[PDB]
Amino acid sequence: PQITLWQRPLVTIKIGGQLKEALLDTGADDTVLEEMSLPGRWKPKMIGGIGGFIKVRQYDQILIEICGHKAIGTVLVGPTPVNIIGRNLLTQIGCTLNF
Amino acid sequence: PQITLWQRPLVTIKIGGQLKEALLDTGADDTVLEEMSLPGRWKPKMIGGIGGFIKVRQYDQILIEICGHKAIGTVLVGPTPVNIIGRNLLTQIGCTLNF
Numbered sequence A, B: 001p002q003i004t005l006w007q008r009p010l011v012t013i014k015i016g017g018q019l020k021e022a023l024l025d026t027g028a029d030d031t032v033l034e035e036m037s038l039p040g041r042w043k044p045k046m047i048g049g050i051g052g053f054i055k056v057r058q059y060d061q062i063l064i065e066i067c068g069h070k071a072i073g074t075v076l077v078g079p080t081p082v083n084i085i086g087r088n089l090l091t092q093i094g095c096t097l098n099f
């Protein structure tokens, strides 16, 4: 689909068998989701954005479904004000910036 | 042009008669540029992103040229680790998210 940018490009994602809603961030290297219950063993990490670095829990090989498309990638879980779909996954559903 | 997301979508911008380079952020509501010399009177503001809020200096009616296209908008200047081209301007050069 073609998403314009007059409204925040929010997209519904199904991850962990839960229904969420995520921002499509092209400035985000990683996909960082809010706090939630996720299966498997993880590892502690630290990411930075405008404002500072946050300690997030990292998960690899994680299936997620953004607007119907499936993609198995690494998801960071931490105190993010909004779910963020970054390039690690945006590339998997084949997303482009056309202007 | 069509920009893929395997590499950070960096784009060269000419603002304030200076040559810069900015990230194309679709998750950014505002266009926030690093510290620099800019003409006109401004106003103090505060924006938040993953990590916290930062006190930035706001400027309105500001011409900028992203990849050759011109657009007069509001630019926030503050301690941002990287120049960010947000939706306030991304909409002006007619940018879309196609996946």
Ligand SMILES: CC(C)(C)OC(=O)N[C@@H](Cc1ccccc1)[C@@H](O)CN[C@@H](Cc1ccccc1)C(=O)N[C@@H](CCC(=O)O)C(=O)N[C@@H](Cc1ccccc1)C(N)=O
Residues within 6 Å of the ligand: A023, A025, A026, A027, A028, A029, A030, A031, A032, A047, A048, A049, A050, A081, A082, A084, A086, B025, B027, B028, B029, B030, B031, B032, B046, B047, B048, B049, B050, B081, B082, B086
């Ligand atoms: C998550 C991680 C993988 C670490 O990537 C980044 O943080 N990337 C950021 C750039 C970067 C990368 C690497 C190193 C340094 C810096 C940027 O692209 C993130 N994009 C969005 C992510 C986001 C959006 C919305 C909510 C939370 C988070 C953003 O900062 N957006 C800010 C940019 C600053 C700005 O324009 O103000 C924004 O639009 N903030 C709005 C909306 C908002 C809502 C809630 C709270 C605070 C702010 C605002 N009003 O200030």
